[PDB]
């Protein structure tokens, strides 16, 4: 039996690791692909725990569309969307 | 670092548990809720390892709209969309 919380925590961690690699590493073009996918799929943009790197990935064009404004980032958190997925929201 | 394959495997197992419990237990309302969220988010319907119960969720309207038909369920596998998510596709 898989725990909701643990698996959510693992997905979050996976996302954060990908988010970081996309900015701190021009090699990992796969990390950009992974980040762009989550952002499109979960309809979100970055993280609260990595608000500095999020503003960069926003201007790298990896977030979905509409905003592109740094003011909005605080309400586009992927950690929340990941929480909502495993909760049923 | 966190294992890309292991997390994908756990997310499937979580989904499979939600899919099963949504049908097997009549009023597992979060079970249904979780299943709907996955379907609507990942654009998919049931899994190929649970084709029997998948037809039962298809007809309970917990799958995405306009895709209702048992024939199509083979190409609407959520297991494949979970694979694509974590591999950036």
């Amino acid at each position, epitope marked *: 039996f898989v725990n909701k919380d643990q698996i959510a925590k693992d997905v979050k961690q996976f996302y954060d690791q990908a988010l970081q690699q996309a900015v*701190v590493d021009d090699d990992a073009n796969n990390a950009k692909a992974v980040v762009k996918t989550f952002h499109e799929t979960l309809d979100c943009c970055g993280s609260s725990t990595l608000t*500095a790197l999020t503003t960069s990935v926003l*201007k790298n064009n990896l977030c979905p569309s509409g905003s*592109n404004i*740094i003011s909005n980032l605080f309400k586009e958190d992927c950690h929340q969307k990941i929480d909502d997925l495993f909760s049923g929201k | *670092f966190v294992n890309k394959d292991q997390i994908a495997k756990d997310v499937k197992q979580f989904y499979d548990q939600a899919l099963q419990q949504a049908v097997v237990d009549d009023d597992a309302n979060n079970a249904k809720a979780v299943v709907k969220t996955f379907h609507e988010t990942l654009d998919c319907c049931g899994s190929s390892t649970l084709t029997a119960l998948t037809t039962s969720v298809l007809k309970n309207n917990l799958c995405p709209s306009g895709s209702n038909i048992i024939s199509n369920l083979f190409k609407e596998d959520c297991h494949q969309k979970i694979d694509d998510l974590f591999s950036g596709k």
Partner: single-chain antibody
Amino acid sequence: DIVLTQSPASLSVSLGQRATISCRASKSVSTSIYSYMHWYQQKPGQPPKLLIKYASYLESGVPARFSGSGSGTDFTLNIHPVEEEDAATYYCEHSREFPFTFGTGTKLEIKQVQLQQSGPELVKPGASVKISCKASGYTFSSSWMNWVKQRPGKGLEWIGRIYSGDGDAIYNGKFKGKATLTADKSSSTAYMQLSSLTSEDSAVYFCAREGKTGDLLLRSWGQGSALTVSS
């Protein structure tokens, strides 16, 4: 804000010889796969230079006799053997969260450039000044332009940063209200605006750039602009 505490404040080693500089953060500056603590070297009259990035990785060109170590809150810079060119002031800095902050500094003592800035300035108290920082068009529009202040004798202070593509700007709360960052693509020039000028706005103001993806590292600097406020 995160406070970075360096030690020792100054150091005199001979041409030998170990030099060990320490840097302590207020809270962790480390994720599961990175920190987020860096080391810059500044010699008199020049902009700082990135030596070690992300705790341990030497920037291209930096001698292997430089080494960086640490995790969480405690980080250490080691030079061995010390040579004449190491006579400088060493600042640690984090890029974990806004605002970016620097360490108090460690002066070591032995026993081509992009980003063109505006010239020196003497200006009355109460006035405004808009300091410029020009780059090549083509390089400009995707640039994350950072601004850093340095009062004579004192350390380094992060003002804010602006994305040149759309002029979207993040400010250090201490300068939010006083500093305005703007970017003009068709001048290839980034500007910093200072209002209600005071004797202690007198400093050298640097303009620094990041790498393509906006890796929060101050790669390219300018010469600085010497703003002095006086009657």
